Amino acid sequence: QLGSRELMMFYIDLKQTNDVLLTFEALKHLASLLLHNKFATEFVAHGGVQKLLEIPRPSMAATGVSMCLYYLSYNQDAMERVCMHPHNVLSDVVNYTLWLMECSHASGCCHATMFFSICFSFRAVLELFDRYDGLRRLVNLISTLEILNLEDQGALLSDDEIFASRQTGKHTCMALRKYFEAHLAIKLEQVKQSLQRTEGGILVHPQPPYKACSYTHEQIVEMMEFLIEYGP
Amino acid sequence: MSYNYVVTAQKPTAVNGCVTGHFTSAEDLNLLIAKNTRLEIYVVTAEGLRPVKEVGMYGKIAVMELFRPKGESKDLLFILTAKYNACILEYKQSGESIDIITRAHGNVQDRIGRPSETGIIGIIDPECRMIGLRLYDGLFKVIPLDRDNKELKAFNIRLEELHVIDVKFLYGCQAPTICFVYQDPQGRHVKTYEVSLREKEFNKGPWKQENVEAEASMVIAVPEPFGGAIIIGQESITYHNGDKYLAIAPPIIKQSTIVCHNRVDPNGSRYLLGDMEGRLFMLLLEKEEQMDGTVTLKDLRVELLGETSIAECLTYLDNGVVFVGSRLGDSQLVKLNVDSNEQGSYVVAMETFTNLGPIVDMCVVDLERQGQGQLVTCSGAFKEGSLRIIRNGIGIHEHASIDLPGIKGLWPLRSDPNRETDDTLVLSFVGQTRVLMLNGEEVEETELMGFVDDQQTFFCGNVAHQQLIQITSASVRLVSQEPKALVSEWKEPQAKNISVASCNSSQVVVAVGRALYYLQIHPQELRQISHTEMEHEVACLDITPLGDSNGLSPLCAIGLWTDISARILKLPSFELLHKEMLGGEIIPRSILMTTFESSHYLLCALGDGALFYFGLNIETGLLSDRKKVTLGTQPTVLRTFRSLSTTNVFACSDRPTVIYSSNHKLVFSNVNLKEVNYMCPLNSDGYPDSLALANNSTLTIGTIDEIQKLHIRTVPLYESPRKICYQEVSQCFGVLSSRIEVQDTSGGTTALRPSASTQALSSSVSSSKLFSSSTAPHETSFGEEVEVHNLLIIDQHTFEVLHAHQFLQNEYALSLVSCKLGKDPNTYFIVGTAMVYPEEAEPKQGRIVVFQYSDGKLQTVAEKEVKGAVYSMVEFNGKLLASINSTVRLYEWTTEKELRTECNHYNNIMALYLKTKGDFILVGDLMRSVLLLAYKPMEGNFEEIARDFNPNWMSAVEILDDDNFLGAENAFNLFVCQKDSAATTDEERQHLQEVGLFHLGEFVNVFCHGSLVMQNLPTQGSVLFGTVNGMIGLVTSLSESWYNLLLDMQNRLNKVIKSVGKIEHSFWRSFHTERKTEPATGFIDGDLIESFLDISRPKMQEVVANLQYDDGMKREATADDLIKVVEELTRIH
């Protein structure tokens, strides 16, 4: 009623000489409102994401941007609206989120890894992922880890570089899970249509952004591993 | 509190059990059809059926059977209700007094016990010594039939065997014995016993039968010559008599389960057998006279006899006439031949009986923009699926349109003596006169006679001596074979103008001032016989053809100006039979003299809308009391005529009714005409023996069909209809349906009969296979009756199936709404579907597909795959509300022809129902109750306002008035919940309160709004409901003063009318689940109060005690005003 959408539109930096500190203490307010889809839809509808994708990259306020992008994709399908735009919008999203996972602020990996765990459903996300370095950036995160470096595991022993580092390896295994749970259904489409060819299939494919990761490891992600044994 | 009012619109039609015998008299076969609560008593005649007395009882008649105990020439009847209230009846007749007398009664229920799985079974012993009952799953109640039971005594002899399938008494073997079909834990068999009444204990049984067929379903005991038992199973027929045995498994009885049977011949020589597909069989028995006295069985034959409706009754009457009673639709009476037809069937179709069947959906809809609505009910089942259209009144719709407003009368003119051929008419204005011809629906004007082409006429009949009567200015004359000169112009010796004349086929009655003339019609001679004078000037005259088809009427009609005249004369001689003068400025359009098949009545059409009830004996001159009936504000006309036959009677009034019959009762029923002034007996070339109707409007040559309140029209579809919606912009219905198909080996499937699904004008098929990744449709072995559903779109007026749309394989359709969503100006169809599979729990697949019907072509616009079955849909404020496996999911139609989920709700067991009004949402759960759910649009989500906690298994819900919520239950009950008011805390406002309980002993499927009567712009609102026995009733909201008015009348009426069975009405209507027996409150059972109209005044005076009457003010109750209250209720229905 009182325009809290429009006021929180104002308080993020728009070619402005503010502090970093107020904006970062405002983005946390912005993220808590973004849990409601009714707020979150009209935030995308007035184009708040392109506003949010203007932050300079070395920034303490980048952590709040890393929070908001994860809360944007969390429950609401506002990201369904993020697909069709002036073309470089997701090309700003993928170029942003792959950096702030890579530069590895101490909780910057705690959200950008959880971001792709949900956003791998959208096939346009995955297409841009391989267009950049992708697993060369992602597997290198595991091969950096010091709990895994047996030659260096007996050097640092404090609980800050262990409780977070045994959490950093946790989320990246779920990111690799939700990666290959998606490509299992991508290449199954390129087998059930390339090998069958109307023998038990319908050739209708206008390439929509559709959530088709099959979402069930108990039944059907298990089942896709069996049906691929009629493969090439 | 909430106060409501429940009546019965349509009496329940689906039948349950049919018994023949000799219930009425000693030597007269009859039929006793019980349907839900009614007990119809027909009689078997040479032409068909003939009703005797219909009796409504307080309970569902579950088990009935006739029996003749030793000592009575006539027989007796035992009836056990659903609330275990047993009774023994006896017909007793004395002149016109026809009464049913209960001989013994008494409730027979145990305190503890699981009821049943095979339902209630009751068997009468053949020697008429005891009455057995299977009631409580581990007992065998025995009622010792004797005169000792002034109330019924009972035993409970323990069945050691638990799960008993069927049970009969075997025939004459010197001791009353019992057969079973018992399901062992390992196998199943047939054991016997022997009841000792003097010792309350089973003695030793004579048969063993250690292993019978694994789906044995019934026992058919064969009678006294060659006694034994036949055990019909799923795939085979056996026989046992202790030692011998036969067995057949004929290839005819393979595809359907035998469910009914009867004994055709009295020595058990033949047996009919029906099934669940429509087939009648005949189990012949070959009687083998083996020795000098030995009668034994030799052979077992099964002969196919043809297809009927799906039977649940089966009674052979006489002369090869079999009655087929159908729960599932169209109970019919059939005839068995001797030779065969072209199809080998012996079953001859005879007159049927309309059944509204299991109503599964309704919609109240108007198709003539009137104040009266029509009701389209999805009736029937598997092959008896049919839409049925229900209207009040009388449907004169095949009518010719003639532009003659305000005409006074049209009278025939003929020249063909022995036929009705070439009948010309008379146009008679006031000041003008012409001659009319009839080209069927069209008319022509000419000049034919030359007598009355100058001056007006009033009455010109058809003389039985092949002549006619002309009344022109002051004289009458006979008519030759269309002359131009007079036969005999008998002038008047007064030289005065005729005020009102009249004529007949043998007599002329002319009133000139007060002088009243008489003419004796001789052949070409008008002889003067008699004459009389009235004390005032005569208002009008009426002549009715009372008897002998000659026109002779021994009574007369006298009406005087500015004075109500009840003067009765002997019209040929004018002898005074009765002299009564009421008084007042109201003038009667004098008298209609028509006998309603039992007594001659006088029907006075009073002026400015009034009606009196007068009853006259034609030979003495005694009149009964009067009664005021409201008609309107204008003078009315009461006539009778011949539509096609049976001497119909019509009321020409501002509220035009047909007086003659209403299910053989003097109750008015309207017509589909706004205002009727006169009628005219024409001879239309496109309407045989019809009549035209003169008004302040057009002239309608119409006839009248079979006169009843609820005229029902059948549109058969030969597949089970699921739901019904309606398009207002487009002129088309929408029917979801269900077709049974078996699976072919080479091809996909095949149907079993050419239903109205395939036979359409265009068809289509579901595409875009979005359930292709699932390997759940495994290959089946045989074609074991899968179901295929489609969307029937049916024409508005012709009711031809315009288009059908087959869905995916194994895809049911469970919900149908047709509304508008968003600002898109189209009006769509929305079909909520689900993907079913057997050998499976609740389904988690399905989709919601939005259809449109632009220009005779159904189009699939959008689709939305949703994980879960879509049970019920409603439109909600421009948004589509859904109900998807205990989740209430609100949608929003985007511009890009898709849907976006707005919110969800999860506190549901299985959200099966949705009803909305404004911004509130009513949800009917599977086990719990009524649930009230808010919608806050500023919050963007839902909100739990309140919830009832008491676990009632829902059947149907409906919001009444945004405070009170009505629900139905599997325990055949109704209740109203109420959003609470004294919200002193948050706990006392999240708890709905049950305000009112009632046992409507019938399973409610549907609720809908909308009345069936005319909107004349009492009670408030109107809710009709649809059930599984064809019982439509009306539920409406009262005012708090009239609640205490009527509820005090019920407790007075519960001491006057002795109900058949001696059942307390408080005991039957009590809310009865498996665990609660709270007495009924809140509702008014209107069908008991409507029975106050039938009670005589020496007993109605005892109804009117020292009671109250509210016409803020206070008055003692009186007779004539309490009966006015009921008629204000009876006009609702």
Q: What is the 3-state secondary structure (H, E, C) of chain A?
A: CCCHHHHHHHCCCCCCCCCHHHHHHHHHHHHHHCCCHHHHHHHHHCCHHHHHCCCCCCCCCHHHHHHHHHHHCCCCCCCCCCCCCCCHHHHHHHHHHHHHHHCCCCCHHHHHHHHHHHHCCCHHHHHHHHHCCCHHHHHHHHCCCCCCCCCCCCCCCCCHHHHCHHHHHHHHHHHHHHHHHHHHHHHHHHHHCCCCCCCCCCCCCCCCCCCCCCCCCCCHHHHHHHHHHHCC
Residues of B in contact with A201 (CB under 8 A): 772
Tell if the CB–CB gap between B773 and A202 is shorter than 8 Å.
Answer: no
Q: How far apart are the C-alpha atoms of B384 and B329, rounded to whole Å?
A: 5
Nearest-Cα distance to chain A for B748, in Å, is 15
Residue B161 is encoded by which pair of tokens? 């065997």
What letters, b where the CB count within 10 A reaches 16 and e where it falls short, cover B439-474? eeeebeeeebbebbeeebbbbbbbbeeebbbbbbeb
- CA–chain centroid gap for B347, Å, is 26
Residue in this structure with the two tokens 């991508």, named with its chain if needed: A186
Closest by CA position to B769, among listed B814, B713, B807, B732: B807
Tell if the CB–CB gap between A36 and B940 is shorter than 8 Å.
Answer: yes
Angle formed at CA B319 by CA B314 and CA B322, multiple of 5 degrees:
15
Residue B923 backbone zone (phi > 0: left; psi -120 to 50: alpha; other: beta): beta
Enumerate the β-bridge partners of residue B921: B916, B933
Residues of B in contact with A45 (CB under 8 A): none
At B207, the amino acid letter reads: W
Q: How far apart are the C-alpha atoms of B719 and B738, rounded to whole Å?
A: 6
Q: Which helix (H) or strand (E) holds B1049?
A: helix B1040-1053
Residues of B in contact with A200 (CB under 8 A): 772
> Which positions in chain A have a beta carbon within 8 angstroms of at least one beta carbon in chain B?
1, 36-38, 77, 192, 200-202, 204, 214, 220, 223, 227
Nearest residue on chain A to B937, judged by CA atoms?
Answer: A38
Contact of A180 with A217, CB cutoff 8 Å:
no
Q: How far apart are the C-alpha atoms of B469 and B426, rounded to whole Å?
A: 12
B702 by DSSP, 3-state: which?
A: strand
B698 by DSSP, 3-state: which?
A: coil
Most A CBs within 10 Å, among B765, B766, B767, B773, to test the A interface: B773
Nearest-Cα distance to chain B for A37, in Å, is 9
Helix spans in B349-490 (H):
none
Contact of B373 with B360, CB cutoff 8 Å:
no
Strands B76-80 and B85-94: antiparallel
Most A CBs within 10 Å, among B864, B891, B896, B900, to test the A interface: B900
Q: Which helix (H) or strand (E) holds B1053?
A: helix B1040-1053
Q: How far apart are the C-alpha atoms of B537 and B100, rounded to whole Å?
A: 53
B1099 by DSSP, 3-state: which?
A: helix
Task: Give the number of other CB atoms < 10 A from CB of residue B410.
Answer: 24
> Which positions in chain B have a beta carbon within 8 angstroms of at least one beta carbon in chain A?
767-769, 772-775, 900, 938, 940
Tell if the CB–CB gap between B772 and A201 is shorter than 8 Å.
Answer: yes
Residue B182 is encoded by which pair of tokens? 């018992």
What letters, b where the CB count within 10 A reaches 16 and e where it falls short, cover B871-902? bbbbbbeebbbbbbbbbbbbbebeeeeebbeb
Q: How far apart are the C-alpha atoms of B860 and B882, rounded to whole Å?
A: 19
Most B CBs within 10 Å, among A186, A198, A202, A226, to test the B interface: A202
Nearest-Cα distance to chain A for B767, in Å, is 9
Q: How far apart are the C-alpha atoms of B197 and B195, rounded to whole Å?
A: 6
Q: How far apart are the C-alpha atoms of B835 and B814, rounded to whole Å?
A: 10
Tell if the CB–CB gap between A202 and B900 is shorter than 8 Å.
Answer: no
- Comparing CB atoms, the residue among A204, A214, A223 nearest residue B775 is A223
The CA–CA distances, whole Å, from B42 to B54, B55, B66 equal 9, 12, 14
B1128 by DSSP, 3-state: which?
A: helix
- Comparing CB atoms, the residue among A204, A223, A227 nearest residue B768 is A204
Q: How far apart are the C-alpha atoms of B477 and B459, rounded to whole Å?
A: 12
Strands B306-307 and B296-302: unpaired
Tell if the CB–CB gap between A38 and B767 is shorter than 8 Å.
Answer: no
Residue B684 is encoded by which pair of tokens? 């239309």
- CA–chain centroid gap for B487, Å, is 56
Q: How far apart are the C-alpha atoms of B794 and B853, rounded to whole Å?
A: 12
Count Cβ–Cβ pairs < 8 Å, chain A vs chain B. 18
B610 by DSSP, 3-state: which?
A: strand
Helix spans in B79-136 (H):
none
- CA–chain centroid gap for B989, Å, is 42
Sign of the dihedral defined by the CA atoms of residues B80, B85, B87, B91, in that order: negative
Contact of B873 with B833, CB cutoff 8 Å:
no
DSSP state, B487?
Answer: S
Contact of B919 with B878, CB cutoff 8 Å:
no
DSSP state, B940?
Answer: T
The CA–CA distances, whole Å, from B172 to B70, B175, B228, B925 equal 15, 7, 9, 53
Nearest residue on chain A to B903, judged by CA atoms?
Answer: A37
Tell if the CB–CB gap between B772 and A37 is shorter than 8 Å.
Answer: no
Residue B540 is encoded by which pair of tokens? 């009008």
At B1079, the amino acid letter reads: P
Angle formed at CA B352 by CA B350 and CA B353, multiple of 5 degrees:
160
Nearest-Cα distance to chain A for B885, in Å, is 18
Strands B331-336 and B313-318: unpaired
Residue B73 is encoded by which pair of tokens? 């020439």
Q: How far apart are the C-alpha atoms of B861 and B850, rounded to whole Å?
A: 6
Q: How far apart are the C-alpha atoms of B1051 and B1065, rounded to whole Å?
A: 9
Q: How far apart are the C-alpha atoms of A221 and B165, rounded to whole Å?
A: 47
DSSP state, B221?
Answer: E
Tell if the CB–CB gap between A220 and B773 is shorter than 8 Å.
Answer: yes
Q: How far apart are the C-alpha atoms of B1057 and B551, rounded to whole Å?
A: 45
Q: How far apart are the C-alpha atoms of B81 and B1065, rounded to whole Å?
A: 13
Residues of A in contact with B769 (CB under 8 A): 202
Residue B451 is encoded by which pair of tokens? 């007598």
What letters, b where the CB count within 10 A reaches 16 and e where it falls short, cover B638-672? bbbbebeeeebbbbbbbbbbbbbbbeeeeebbbbb
Please give the class, per CATH, of domain B4-352: mainly beta
Closest by CA position to B84, among listed B67, B104, B61, B101: B61
| CATH of B399-711 among 2.130.10.10, 1.10.3720.10, 1.10.3470.10, 3.20.20.450 | 2.130.10.10
CA dihedral B688, B690, B692, B698 (to 10 degrees): -70
Nearest-Cα distance to chain A for B843, in Å, is 15
Most B CBs within 10 Å, among A34, A36, A37, A192, to test the B interface: A37
DSSP state, B459?
Answer: -
DSSP state, B222?
Answer: E
